[PDB]
Design an enzyme around this catalytic site. Structure first.
Site, PDB file in Angstrom:
ATOM      1  N   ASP A 172       8.676  86.293 -50.451  1.00 31.09           N
ATOM      2  CA  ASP A 172       9.217  87.387 -51.255  1.00 31.09           C
ATOM      3  C   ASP A 172       8.904  88.786 -50.705  1.00 31.09           C
ATOM      4  O   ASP A 172       7.775  89.065 -50.304  1.00 31.09           O
ATOM      5  CB  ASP A 172       8.647  87.281 -52.664  1.00 31.09           C
ATOM      6  CG  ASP A 172       9.259  88.283 -53.611  1.00 31.09           C
ATOM      7  OD1 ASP A 172      10.496  88.200 -53.833  1.00 31.09           O
ATOM      8  OD2 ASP A 172       8.503  89.135 -54.144  1.00 31.09           O
ATOM      9  N   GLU A 205      12.617  86.955 -47.368  1.00 30.26           N
ATOM     10  CA  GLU A 205      13.615  87.776 -48.023  1.00 30.26           C
ATOM     11  C   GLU A 205      13.354  89.206 -47.595  1.00 30.26           C
ATOM     12  O   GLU A 205      12.553  89.918 -48.203  1.00 30.26           O
ATOM     13  CB  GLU A 205      13.510  87.653 -49.550  1.00 30.26           C
ATOM     14  CG  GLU A 205      14.523  88.501 -50.351  1.00 30.26           C
ATOM     15  CD  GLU A 205      13.893  89.631 -51.198  1.00 30.26           C
ATOM     16  OE1 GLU A 205      12.671  89.587 -51.530  1.00 30.26           O
ATOM     17  OE2 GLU A 205      14.653  90.564 -51.563  1.00 30.26           O
TER      18      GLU A 205
END
Ligand SMILES: [Ca+2]
Ligand SMILES: [Ca+2]
Ligand SMILES: [Ca+2]
Ligand code: NA
Length: 481
Positions: free
Chosen positions: A232, A262
């Site tokens: 993340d 990400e």
């Protein structure tokens, strides 16, 4: 088989504690349709039971301890999670755990911290003198005690926050003062330095933070028996930290640990920098492709489809691309809303699923729908394409991105997958036809559209060619009948 991953959550899942169960009960069917890896939602305790998990309170509380008003997470309890992971393992399906290390929210207590305000638009600019704020930085995890980890988070493990409990001003970011205190680098340069995102920002320069996040990394892997990671917010985390954290965990666990990061920026140059800076040791989601897809879907047929892969990770670095149509960030109403329109969604999935390049990801929100936002399940339309990928998308590929509406590619199939070979053909505009080569060994084979979008058949000529057709605003995937 071809590897296919699935993001098995969306933002607006019900808070019913039944998601680990759904996953468990879906493991067999998902594997049977060719899903070979599941990225699971954040597994740890959020700031509350309804937190999707990115409000990361306790990385060591996997729905196990009574913290934040709940034992279970939004998705269920730890034991439910293990049953589901086990369901996945019995099916040979890989488990990718989400990884949220950028920040921590839901601190137990505040600390008085000497801080400086920074320009939210350029966090490099200090816009105040030092003063003391009341910052939410104390994580004692009273519901967990020292089970699993005795590590307590304090202000000095963080770089900054966005809230002064004593003053309660909005729209501010506070950088913490102290020896060695600075926003981390390297991180994305949007807003000058994009280290700060939300909550209490983790200081990746702090040795205790580095040591702790590395060992949690092992613990998390060992505990849940993860096969990899979805990382993340990597544009807000010191690049070298992520690179070395990953290497640490692979070193310590002895596991390959596939990882996809990400790094959300519609900017291939930026993704390339991140890949260089992380020594190419993991993949990134193809965010530029997502945007291409979205743009295409918004263009009413006016997009130049031949340029659909232009500027994307999967075109230039497909081994380091995870291709996806949508995720929880791009879904309707969310922070990065850019949802690929429904009409185009099959074409987007045919693009990521039936080509040999990149590692495709299926969005739960796409597959099962987003009932909160009247997004229909598109499982009925995605399933034929997953079948294409699973059983047909093999062997030499031939690309035909040679028209502004009608593009396609073929796969010659291979000997390991009997009757494999396809011809995908799509149009963002009016339909039509395209001569494509599927292999001369396919001569006289009768083919049909596995999506059922086009009725009827196509017979491979003597040369291994056929004039495949497609309807308007649509995709057809021709395979041996
Ligand atoms: Ca720092
Ligand atoms: Ca950060
Ligand atoms: Ca077009
Ligand atoms: Na930081």
């Amino acid at each position: 088989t071809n590897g296919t991953m699935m993001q098995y959550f969306e933002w607006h899942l019900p808070n019913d504690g039944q998601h680990w169960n759904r996953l468990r009960d879906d493991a067999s069917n998902l594997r049977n349709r060719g899903i070979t890896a599941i990225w699971i939602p954040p597994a740890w305790k959020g700031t509350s039971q309804n937190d999707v998990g990115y409000g990361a309170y306790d990385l060591y509380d996997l729905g196990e301890f009574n913290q934040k008003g709940t034992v279970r997470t939004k998705y269920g309890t730890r034991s439910q999670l293990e049953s589901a992971i086990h369901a996945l393992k019995n099916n040979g399906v890989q488990v990718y755990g989400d990884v949220v290390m950028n920040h921590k929210g839901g601190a137990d207590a505040t600390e008085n911290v000497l801080a400086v305000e920074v320009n939210p638009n350029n966090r490099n600019q200090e816009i105040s003198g030092d003063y003391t704020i009341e910052a939410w930085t104390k994580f004692d995890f009273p519901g967990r005690g020292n089970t699993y980890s005795d590590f307590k988070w304090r202000w000095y493990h963080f770089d900054g926050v966005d809230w002064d409990q004593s003053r309660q001003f909005q729209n501010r970011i506070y950088k913490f003062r102290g020896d060695g205190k600075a926003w981390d680098w390297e991180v994305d340069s949007e807003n000058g330095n994009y280290d700060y995102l939300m909550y209490a920002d983790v200081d990746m320069d702090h040795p205790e933070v580095v040591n702790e996040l590395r060992r949690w990394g092992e613990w998390y892997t060992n505990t849940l028996n993860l096969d990899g990671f979805r990382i993340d917010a990597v544009k807000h985390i010191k690049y070298s930290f992520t690179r070395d954290w990953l290497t640490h965990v692979r070193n310590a666990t002895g596991k390959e640990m596939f990882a996809v990061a990400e790094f959300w920026k519609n900017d291939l140059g930026a993704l390339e920098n991140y890949l260089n800076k992380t020594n190419w040791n993991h993949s990134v989601f193809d965010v530029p492709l997502h945007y291409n897809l979205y743009n295409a879907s918004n263009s009413g047929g006016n997009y130049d489809m031949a340029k659909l892969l232009n500027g994307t990770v999967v075109q230039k670095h497909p081994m380091h691309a995870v291709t996806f149509v949508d995720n929880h960030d791009s879904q309707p109403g969310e922070s990065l809303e850019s949802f690929v329109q429904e009409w185009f969604k099959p074409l987007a999935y045919a693009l990521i699923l039936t080509r040999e390049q990149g590692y495709p990801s299926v969005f739960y929100g796409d597959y099962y729908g987003i009932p909160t936002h009247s997004v229909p399940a598109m499982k009925a339309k995605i399933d034929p394409i997953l079948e294409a990928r699973q059983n047909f998308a093999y062997g030499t590929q031939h690309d035909y991105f040679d028209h502004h509406n009608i593009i396609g590619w073929t796969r010659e199939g291979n000997t390991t997958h009997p009757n494999s070979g396809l011809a995908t053909i799509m149009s963002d505009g009016p339909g039509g036809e395209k001569w494509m080569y599927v292999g001369q060994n396919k001569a006289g084979q009768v083919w049909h559209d596995i999506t059922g979008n086009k009725p009827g058949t196509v017979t491979i000529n003597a040369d291994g060619w056929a004039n495949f057709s497609v309807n308007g605003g649509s995709v057809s995937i021709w395979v041996k009948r």
